Amino acid sequence: DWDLVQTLGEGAYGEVQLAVNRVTEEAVAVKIVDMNIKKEICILKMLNHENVIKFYGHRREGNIQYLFMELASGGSLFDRIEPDIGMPEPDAQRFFHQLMAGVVYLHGIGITHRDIKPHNLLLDERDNLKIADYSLATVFRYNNRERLLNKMCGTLPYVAPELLKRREFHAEPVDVWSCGIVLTAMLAGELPWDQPSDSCQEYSDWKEKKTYLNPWKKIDSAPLALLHKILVENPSARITIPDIKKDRWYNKPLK
Numbered sequence: 001d002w003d004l005v006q007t008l009g010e011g012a013y014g015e016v017q018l019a020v021n022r023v024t025e026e027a028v029a030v031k032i033v034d035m036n037i038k039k040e041i042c043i044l045k046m047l048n049h050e051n052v053i054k055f056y057g058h059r060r061e062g063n064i065q066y067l068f069m070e071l072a073s074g075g076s077l078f079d080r081i082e083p084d085i086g087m088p089e090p091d092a093q094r095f096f097h098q099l100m101a102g103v104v105y106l107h108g109i110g111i112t113h114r115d116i117k118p119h120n121l122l123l124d125e126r127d128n129l130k131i132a133d134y135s136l137a138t139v140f141r142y143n144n145r146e147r148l149l150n151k152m153c154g155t156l157p158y159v160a161p162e163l164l165k166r167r168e169f170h171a172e173p174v175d176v177w178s179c180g181i182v183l184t185a186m187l188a189g190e191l192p193w194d195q196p197s198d199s200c201q202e203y204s205d206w207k208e209k210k211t212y213l214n215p216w217k218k219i220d221s222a223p224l225a226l227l228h229k230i231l232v233e234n235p236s237a238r239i240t241i242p243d244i245k246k247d248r249w250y251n252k253p254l255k
């Protein structure tokens with residue numbers, strides 16, 4: 001029925017392989033998991049937006065589960081990022097528009113991703129950004145009540161400072177922060193710091209506003225103004241998405 005033709009990458013749980021149908025030659029992405037999975041499936045079925053991977057279905061063989069997702073012809077945003085360069089500012093702005101739309105949708109249905117980074121942002125045939133990999137995603141709003149998060153997870157260069165330092169924190173500002181690191185990656189082709197901690201010299205340099213160093217040097221003043229509002233240490237002062245949508249660079253016509 002299915003031939004694991006190429007391994008695509010490791011998810012938080014198990015791996016995802018490019019599977020080819022041996023009857024139609026259908027190229028599709030499948031996540032294999034032998035034995036939280038109840039939760040990742042529940043969440044995938046809630047998901048319906050142009051900037052979130054299309055969810056197909058699931059089947060169990062013993063304690064081995066199968067998740068099928070729309071294969072991304074474009075691959076990952078990571079592969080569109082030239083090390084030490086990034087990408088043309090107009091392409092960065094379009095991907096950031098689509099990433100915001102994806103994130104507005106997810107937060108709208110009380111879901112937080114918790115691992116936004118270029119490896120998990122896929123591109124379709126016409127280069128549309130899709131947020132994939134819901135293995136860390138969880139509900140932060142249900143029956144119109146916010147739940148605070150208390151599980152540390154994600155990728156250290158992407159995680160917000162509050163997640164390293166607070167017992168509990170709001171979900172939405174954590175996703176916004178990781179969108180800021182992604183914007184940094186797209187415009188500079190490098191990550192600013194290993195982790196946003198007081199011990200980390202690059203992160204201290206940023207707090208003390210030294211934007212004459214890298215990667216901020218390589219970033220035009222308009223997008224850097226926006227990164228100034230996103231990468232704010234106190235999550236309560238950090239810009240929200242409604243207010244990102246009012247940002248000058250965000251509304252700047254480009255190309």
Ligand SMILES: C[C@@H]1CCCN1c1c(C#N)c2c(N)nc(Nc3cnn(C)c3)nc2n1C
Nearest residue numbers: 008009010011029070071072075120132133
């Ligand atoms: C986003 C997750 C993290 C681990 C690897 N990964 C995925 C996919 C998923 N889900 C995924 C996918 N659906 N389609 C593709 N297509 C692809 C990959 N390379 N090229 C050239 C095209 N990749 C996926 N990856 C990496």
